[PDB]
Amino acid sequence: EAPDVDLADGNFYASREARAAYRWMRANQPVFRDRNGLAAASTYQAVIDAERQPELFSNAGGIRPDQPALPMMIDMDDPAHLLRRKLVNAGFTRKRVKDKEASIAALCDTLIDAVCERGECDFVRDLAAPLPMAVIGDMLGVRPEQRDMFLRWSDDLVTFLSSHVSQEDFQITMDAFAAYNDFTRATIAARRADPTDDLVSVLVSSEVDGERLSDDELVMETLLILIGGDETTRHTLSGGTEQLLRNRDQWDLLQRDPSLLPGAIEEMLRWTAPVKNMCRVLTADTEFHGTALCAGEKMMLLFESANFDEAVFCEPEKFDVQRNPNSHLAFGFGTHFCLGNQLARLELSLMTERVLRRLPDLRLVADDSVLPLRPANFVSGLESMPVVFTPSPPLG
Numbered sequence: 001e002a003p004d005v006d007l008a009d010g011n012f013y014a015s016r017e018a019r020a021a022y023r024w025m026r027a028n029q030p031v032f033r034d035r036n037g038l039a040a041a042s043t044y045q046a047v048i049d050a051e052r053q054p055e056l057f058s059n060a061g062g063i064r065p066d067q068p069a070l071p072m073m074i075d076m077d078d079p080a081h082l083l084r085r086k087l088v089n090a091g092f093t094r095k096r097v098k099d100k101e102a103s104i105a106a107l108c109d110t111l112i113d114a115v116c117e118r119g120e121c122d123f124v125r126d127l128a129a130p131l132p133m134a135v136i137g138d139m140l141g142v143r144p145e146q147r148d149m150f151l152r153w154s155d156d157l158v159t160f161l162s163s164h165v166s167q168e169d170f171q172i173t174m175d176a177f178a179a180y181n182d183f184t185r186a187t188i189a190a191r192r193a194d195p196t197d198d199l200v201s202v203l204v205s206s207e208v209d210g211e212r213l214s215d216d217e218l219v220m221e222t223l224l225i226l227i228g229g230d231e232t233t234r235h236t237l238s239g240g241t242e243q244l245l246r247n248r249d250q251w252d253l254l255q256r257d258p259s260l261l262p263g264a265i266e267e268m269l270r271w272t273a274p275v276k277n278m279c280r281v282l283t284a285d286t287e288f289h290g291t292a293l294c295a296g297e298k299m300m301l302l303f304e305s306a307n308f309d310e311a312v313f314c315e316p317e318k319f320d321v322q323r324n325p326n327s328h329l330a331f332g333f334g335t336h337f338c339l340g341n342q343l344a345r346l347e348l349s350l351m352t353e354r355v356l357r358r359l360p361d362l363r364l365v366a367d368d369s370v371l372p373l374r375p376a377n378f379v380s381g382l383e384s385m386p387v388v389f390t391p392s393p394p395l396g
C-alpha cells in the first residue's frame, strides 16, 4: 500500500519517515500522486528527465505548489531566463566567488572564537546559521548588528514559500518584502552615484545583449540571492556535520586527510538536500515515466528522494565522504542549476575545515532520535544541534 502523505505539508519533511515514503514511490510509482493528487517525480531518472525538458516542465508558473510566479529568474523560462541569469551571473563568476575565500574564512574564525572557550555550543545557532548570513549580508552591505533583522525577513519569506500562509502571515510576508525593498533601493541609488565592489554595484554595472537590470529586477534578484544565501547552506552545514559526528570513522578520515574534504562536502550536500522540492508546471498533457500528467498542473521534483535513489547511489543510506561518483541533485540540474553553488560549497569547505581542526574532539550531546527537523515544505534542516568539545583559546 502507498504511503498516505501530503507532499505540500511541512510536517512530511520534518518526519524521519519521509525517506521510507520516497523508497516506496521509487519502487512502485516513480511519478507519484500524493493523497491530494499532487504529482511528484521521486526517482533520479524522472527528476533528470523533467529537468531536461523545460518546454514541457516549465518554471514560469512558479516553483511552489500553490503560489503564482514571481518576476525573478527562478520563475522564468528561456530565453528570458537566460538573459536574466547572464545579467545576475556578474556577481557569481568563478573568480569573484573564489576571491571571497579569505573573508569567509575570517568570518568562520570569528564565529568559532565566540564559542571555543565554552566547550559547548548549539552548532545550528552558533555556527551553521550565522556563517552564511554574515557572508551574504556582507555582500549586500548589511551592518553586522543588522544581520538578525535581515535573517528575520528571510525566515518570514522562506516560511511563506514553505507553506500556505494565513492572512496574518501573508501580511508579515508583505511587510518584510517592503522593508527589504526599501533598504535595497537605497543601496541601488547609492551604488549608482558612488560605485563600490559590492554585489549591488556589480549587478548595476552588468550588461548583456545591450540590456541591464532594472531597479525592480535588482530588488527581486538580490532577494532571491539573500534567501538562497541565508536559508539553505546552514542546513548542509548542520546536517552534514551531524553525519560526520554520528559516524566517527568519517570524522576521523577527514581529520587525518584534508584532501578528502571536497568529497565530504559533496556527500554532505547529497545527504542533507536542504531544498526538498521545486515545482514545474506542465505545458501539455503528457505520459511521464508511467503517470499521466495534465496541462497546467504542477509536479514537484523531489531532490532528496533522487539523492537516495539506489539505482544511482549504491547503499544510499550509508554516509560515505569518499563516494565517487556523487552526482547528487541538491543543487538541481539543467537551466536552473543553483547559481550559488560555488559560494555554498566554499562556505561549507571553509567552515568544515575549521571545525575539524579547531574543535577536533567535537561530539553530539544527544543523538538524532531527539534532534528535530524544521517543518517546512520547501527548505528544511535541523532546528538545533547541541555539541560539546574540549575548550581552546580564540585566534583573535
Ligand code: HEM
Residues within 6 Å of the ligand: 051, 073, 074, 075, 085, 136, 224, 225, 226, 228, 229, 230, 232, 233, 236, 273, 274, 275, 278, 303, 330, 331, 332, 333, 334, 335, 336, 337, 338, 339, 340, 341, 343, 344
Ligand atoms: C546548499 C545551498 C543551496 C542549495 C541546496 C541550493 C539549491 C538550489 C536549487 C535546487 C535550485 C533550483 C535548481 C533546479 O530546480 O534544478 C537553486 C536555484 C538557485 N539558487 Fe540555490 N541553493 C543553495 C544556495 C544558494 C546560494 C548561496 C545562492 C546565492 C548566493 C543561491 C542562488 C540561487 C539562484 C539565483 C537560483 C536560481 C537559478 C536559476 O533559476 O537559473 N543558492 N538553488
Ligand SMILES: COc1ccc(CNc2ccc(Cc3ccncc3)cc2)cc1
Residues within 6 Å of the ligand: 070, 074, 157, 160, 161, 173, 177, 223, 224, 227, 228, 229, 232, 275, 338, 340
Ligand atoms: C511574496 O513576495 C516574495 C518575493 C520574493 C520571495 C523570495 N523568492 C525566493 C527566495 C528563495 C528561494 C529559495 C532558494 C534560493 C536559492 N537557492 C535555493 C533555494 C526561492 C524563491 C518570496 C516572496
Ligand SMILES: [Br-]
Residues within 6 Å of the ligand: 030, 043, 045, 046, 289
Ligand atoms: Br523512473
Ligand SMILES: [Br-]
Residues within 6 Å of the ligand: 060, 075, 076, 077, 078, 080, 081
Ligand atoms: Br519567462
Ligand SMILES: [Br-]
Residues within 6 Å of the ligand: 091, 139, 197, 198, 199, 200, 202
Ligand atoms: Br559581492
Ligand SMILES: [K+]
Residues within 6 Å of the ligand: 149, 179
Ligand atoms: K524590521
Ligand SMILES: [K+]
Residues within 6 Å of the ligand: 314, 315, 316, 317, 318
Ligand atoms: K542503503
